[PDB]
Design a protein around this ligand. Structure first.
Ligand SMILES: [Mg+2]
Ligand SMILES: [Mg+2]
Ligand SMILES: [Mg+2]
Ligand SMILES: [Mg+2]
Ligand SMILES: [Mg+2]
Ligand SMILES: [Zn+2]
Lengths: 166, 174, 295, 246, 110, 153
């Protein structure tokens, strides 16, 4: 197996010089060996990517999936560690930077079909990885406007050169 | 800014909801009564009928079916089309609509203001009439144009005539 | 005096910043204040917060982002209190939203905030060669359908009245100001410094004097957002973006024996309490009428 | 197909294995402090005068019978033991222990402080950055009392020496993220404590190890935290009603 | 029918990352003015409903303890009171339930 | 094509659906407030409304007698229906039952659940959705409109 998301939270940074901007705190957390499915957890993880922790908890409270409760407990635990261990004031000033789901060790069983035939059943297990960063959530990227499209088009025409000329 | 959805009944109180309903109902009654006399406000000039001319239609409500017997003893079946609220909404000129015949837009039965879009409500606000359910376009000739906001009545068709009926049929699904 | 309007704005901001620096330098150390939460939702909550630095907005951020999004006003143990005004002593805090059982204080705060916003729009929507002096913001109840601001224009503006296009432009400037988020900041100053802050508007000086006359300690409540400084009673809303619907309804020229004052009346509703299109048109039609309530 | 998980971690202790040890656990020190010295509440004003502090701190050392018998037992157990040469060694040990915690040099910290003292100075700080320095000493360290605990079952004598220290220290505890957390590194804040050293007398080596770290009850409170702290209330179940204490 | 070729990861991602299959965000979420917990605008508050359900369960348990049989149902109206209460003139003549708990704030006399 | 259908399909058929509704109605009459699936409670709402109307016809009405005998499976509820529910619903025309959607079931099925309750029962009041007070900004502006309208006449 591999365990690096748990050790990613033990790194110590050098002291900041007087005058440097305050670097936001990062908190890594993970839940290992969840009975719920990999792609199904990926759906919930993609749901709460980039929003605030409070909004993610609100969405997971009324999400009907089985993994919604697991992700909500994971987020609550991560917030608790951020408040207690790290010097994270403003416990509502965290946003989910990364939220992914991977696969774990599966179980192989026999699923009978008939006529003496069988298939291999994979009892699935998944791991959930989350990262909370101090600060307001980043703004969502808006679609490119017509002015920007025209600017880019003009730039592509201006960047032309006479190929195989000289 | 994750703004939530808001309807017209969410932030109102038990005392103001009937007040709002009455304030909309009386305005709609007054607006419908204002257009009840179109020929005396500012009628557009009426042109003489030409053999190549076409006429505007209506938007009625299908009530039901009835039997009807003829003087020769035969039995026909008639369908009931009730003209509740027909008003001319907008007028599109010939060259800006098709280049051959102008278009008059006609509205149907009145609906509520609280479930229409902002642009539709703005259009009906500038028109001076309450919103309509079904809005259709009729291709008419240039000599049969009528000022928008004019009401239409079921006596527009006379006993003995042939009409064409357009509607969405009973949808039986997949 | 030969002073550009941008120079006046710069001087006002600089002197306000100096007063703020004096206020923070008044406290040399960071004292810990124990603030109780007396709200209906979470009783017994304790906040160990910094003296003269911490704010009820920071208290709400400690609680949850829902409190920050909903709560407009703070009740510090006996009085309304804006979100961006630092706390002074140990106390108890109760948060107040728009949809509370008795939201009158929040309604008044939003009312004065909208009046100050409209005055900010007016003072800078006029040409430089003409003179504009803001008198005050007449506090009329929420019963009245429009918030009023008193403006004295140049002597040659007494003939014309702003039309639908001018009201349209005023509304556009108000919405542009709404679009950018500008926090409301409350500073407690004295009359001796308020006079030198304004120094130009005779009506504003008279208002400052009459507001300081009732106060034995001669304390003037000043509010500042962006580049606009004005004096008003009580607290204000924390953020500009709270105002969602905004309209400059009408203008009414009231003539006195000394001068003529334009009462600019406008209508606004917040993000939480937005109404339907027809309801908003009805409210605007009502707000078109005269509003007269000074005492 | 028949496969199951393994590695279920549980910590289950029973008295049978805790009593069936072939060898007893070797302890380099005792559990805590036996006799805690309660200082008079007037030291804060007494220390402002030189002789009015030193004369009293000399008299109370000699007039106590328990302290004198303890020091006599220490002399008879180990020669070349002098009280007059103790405070300088204690101050040096204090300075070196603080520098060791600054360095995160756990080996030398282990050699200096004892087993009951190391965890209390490593637990909450092993994940942070410390910048501690020594600048001055307003008052020399004064030996207050000496106590000895003798346990006859193993024939083990543990001697503890209490030294009152008035120190001028500058402390700056940083973050694992490098941001300032506790205090500034240039402020020379004054502090007053009572350090309790322990040394096993039966052991031939017998290093002087710091054991306890006593603060007076009337001492001024520590400096406020730079951050803001929220204290949650009692989590209320739906079927229970809140009661406001008055 | 059997598949002809293995579908690549590009096709798989384009299929199962479409917005139709993604979970939609719910914008009807609001907080309960009574207890401060989360609830939907068209759905009763879970916390307050749980309080009411537990109180109803206790009341029903007591009123069924009053009736020692399964088919012994009162033929008159019923009234529940808490410690420190007395039946009024308009509440007399009905079956009575007495609880040791004090009257809750949400439960009104009426 | 299910145009013009008012009865939804429940249970193992029409008779099983009727039996399920009968059990739900018996429970509702016995306990004065029950909870079930949203569809089941929605369908039971009309039957509970009609049962009170039938009980209001009087005890001596043989048709209502046999209707109650069929529906109320527990026979001790028929006297209760005819002497508690019917007498207390006299001035009311059709406001006999109140239905509210509760959060989804905590079980894995996550069903859409509703609660139905006879009005005027001896149970703690549910957290009904209360409208805003008239002291709100919007409602106060509406009160100003109402005052102007009243003064205009
Ligand atoms: Mg077989
Ligand atoms: Mg497989
Ligand atoms: Mg295979
Ligand atoms: Mg169909
Ligand atoms: Mg079925
Ligand atoms: Zn609630």
């Amino acid at each position: 197996i591999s365990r690096k998301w748990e050790k990613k939270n033990k790194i110590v940074y050098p002291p900041q010089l007087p005058g440097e901007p305050r670097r936001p705190a990062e908190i890594y957390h993970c839940r290992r060996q969840i009975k719920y499915s990999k792609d199904k957890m990926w759906y919930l993880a993609k749901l709460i990517r980039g929003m605030s922790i409070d909004q993610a908890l609100a969405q997971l409270e009324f999400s009907d999936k089985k993994g919604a409760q697991i992700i909500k407990e994971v987020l609550l635990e991560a917030q608790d560690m951020a408040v207690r261990d790290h010097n994270v004031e403003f416990r509502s000033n965290l946003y989910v930077a990364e939220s992914t789901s991977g696969r774990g060790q599966y179980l192989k069983r026999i699923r009978y079909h008939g006529r003496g035939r069988f298939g291999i059943m994979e009892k699935v297990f998944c791991h959930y990885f989350v990262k909370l960063v101090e600060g307001p959530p980043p703004p969502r990227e808006a679609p490119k406007t017509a002015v920007a499209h025209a600017r880019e088009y003009i730039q592509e025409l201006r960047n032309r050169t006479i190929t195989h000329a000289l | 800014h994750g703004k939530s959805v808001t309807w017209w009944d969410e932030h109102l109180s038990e005392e103001n909801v009937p007040f709002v309903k009455q304030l909309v109902s009386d305005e709609n009654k007054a607006q419908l009564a204002s257009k009840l006399c179109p020929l005396k406000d500012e009628p557009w000039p009426i042109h003489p009928w030409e053999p190549g001319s076409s006429r505007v239609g209506l938007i009625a409500l299908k009530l039901g079916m009835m039997p009807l017997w003829t003087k020769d003893g035969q039995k026909h079946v008639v369908t009931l089309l009730q003209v509740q609220d027909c008003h001319v909404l907008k007028y599109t000129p010939k060259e800006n609509h098709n280049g051959r015949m102008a278009a008059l837009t006609v509205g149907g039965k009145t609906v509520s203001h609280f479930h229409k879009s902002a642009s539709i409500l703005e259009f009906y606000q500038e028109l001076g009439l309450p919103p309509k359910q079904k809005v259709k376009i009729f291709n008419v000739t240039e000599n049969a144009v009528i000022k928008p906001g004019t009401p239409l009545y079921a006596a527009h068709f006379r006993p003995g005539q042939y009409v064409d009926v357009t509607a969405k049929t009973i949808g039986k699904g997949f | 005096s030969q002073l550009s309007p941008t120079e006046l704005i710069e001087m006002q901001n600089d002197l306000f910043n100096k007063e703020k620096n004096r206020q923070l330098s008044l406290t040399p150390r960071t004292e810990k204040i124990e603030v109780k939460h007396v709200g209906k939702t979470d009783p017994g909550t304790v906040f160990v917060m910094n003296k003269n630095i911490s704010t009820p907005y920071s208290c709400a951020m400690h609680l949850s982002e829902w409190y920050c999004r909903k709560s407009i006003l703070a009740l510090v143990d006996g009085q309304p209190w804006d979100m961006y005004k630092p706390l002074t002593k140990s106390c108890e805090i109760k948060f107040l939203t728009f949809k509370d059982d008795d939201p009158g204080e929040v309604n008044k705060a939003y009312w004065r905030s909208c009046a100050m916003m409209m005055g900010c729009v007016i003072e800078r929507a006029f040409k430089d060669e003409y003179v504009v002096s803001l008198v005050r913001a007449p506090e009329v109840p929420v019963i009245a359908g429009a918030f009023c601001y008193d403006v004295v224009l140049d002597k040659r503006l007494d003939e014309w009245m702003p039309t639908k296009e001018n009201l349209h432009s005023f509304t556009k400037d108000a919405r542009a100001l709404i679009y950018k988020d500008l926090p409301f900041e409350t500073l407690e100053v004295e009359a001796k410094v308020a006079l030198e802050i304004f120094q130009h508007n005779k009506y504003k000086l008279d208002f400052i004097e009459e507001k300081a006359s009732q106060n034995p300690e001669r304390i003037v409540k000043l509010h500042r957002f962006g580049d606009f400084i004005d004096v008003s009673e009580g607290p204000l809303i924390p953020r500009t973006s709270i105002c969602f619907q905004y309209e400059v309804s009408a203008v009414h020229n009231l003539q006195t024996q000394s001068s003529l004052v334009r009462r600019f009346q406008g209508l606004s509703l917040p993000v939480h309490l937005r109404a339907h299109f027809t309801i908003w048109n009805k409210l605007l039609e009502r707000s078109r009428k005269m509003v007269t309530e000074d005492k | 197909s028949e496969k199951e998980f393994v590695e279920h971690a549980r910590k289950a202790g029973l008295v049978i294995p805790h009593e069936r040890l072939e060898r007893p656990i070797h302890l380099a020190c005792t559990a805590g402090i036996f006799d805690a010295y309660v200082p008079p509440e007037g030291d804060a004003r007494i220390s402002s005068l030189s002789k009015e502090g030193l004369a009293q701190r000399a008299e109370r050392l000699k007039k106590n019978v328990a302290s004198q018998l303890s020091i006599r037992k220490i002399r008879e157990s180990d020669p070349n033991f002098k009280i007059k040469d103790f405070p300088e060694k204690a101050k040096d040990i204090f300075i070196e222990a603080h520098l060791c915690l600054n360095n995160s040099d756990h080996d030398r910290l282990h050699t200096l402080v004892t087993e009951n003292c190391f965890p209390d100075m490593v637990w909450d700080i092993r994940y942070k950055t410390v910048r501690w320095s020594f600048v001055e000493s307003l008052e020399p360290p004064q030996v207050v009392q000496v106590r000895c605990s003798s346990l006859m079952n193993q024939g083990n004598i543990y001697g503890q020496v209490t030294v009152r220290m008035h120190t001028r220290q500058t402390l700056a505890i940083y973050d694992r993220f490098g941001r300032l957390m506790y205090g500034q590194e240039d402020v020379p804040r004054d502090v007053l404590e009572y350090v309790v050293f322990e040394k096993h007398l039966v052991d031939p080596y017998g290093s002087w190890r710091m054991h306890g770290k006593i603060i007076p009850p009337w001492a001024p409170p520590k400096q406020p935290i730079l951050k803001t702290v929220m204290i949650p209330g009692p989590q209320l179940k739906p079927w229970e009603e809140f009661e406001e204490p008055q | 029918a059997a598949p002809k070729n293995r579908r690549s990861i590009e096709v798989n991602r384009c299929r199962r990352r479409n917005p139709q299959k993604l979970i939609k965000v719910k914008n009807n979420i609001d907080v309960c003015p009574e207890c401060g917990h989360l609830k939907q605008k068209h759905i009763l508050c879970g916390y307050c409903y749980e309080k009411v359900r537990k109180e109803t369960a206790e009341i029903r348990r007591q009123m069924g303890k009053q009736e020692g049989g399964p088919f012994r149902a009162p033929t008159t109206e019923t009234v529940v009171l808490y410690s420190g209460e007395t039946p009024s003139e308009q509440d007399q003549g009905k079956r009575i339930i007495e609880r040791e708990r004090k009257r809750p704030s949400w439960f009104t006399q009426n | 094509i299910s145009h013009g259908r008012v009865f939804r399909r429940l249970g193992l058929g029409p008779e099983s659906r009727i039996h399920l509704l009968q059990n739900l109605l018996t429970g509702l009459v016995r306990h004065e407030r029950i909870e079930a699936s949203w569809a089941r409670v929605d369908e039971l709402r009309g039957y509970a409304e009609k049962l009170i109307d039938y009980g209001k016809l009087g005890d001596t009405n043989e048709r209502a007698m046999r209707m109650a005998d069929f529906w109320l499976t527990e026979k001790d509820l028929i006297p209760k229906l005819f002497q508690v529910l019917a007498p207390r619903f006299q001035g009311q025309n059709g406001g006999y039952t109140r239905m509210l959607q509760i959060p989804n079931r905590n079980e894995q099925d996550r069903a859409k659940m509703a609660v139905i309750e006879y009005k005027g029962n001896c149970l703690p009041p549910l957290p009904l959705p209360r409208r805003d007070s008239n002291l709100t900004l919007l409602n106060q502006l509406l009160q100003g409109l109402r005052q102007d309208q009243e003064a205009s006449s």
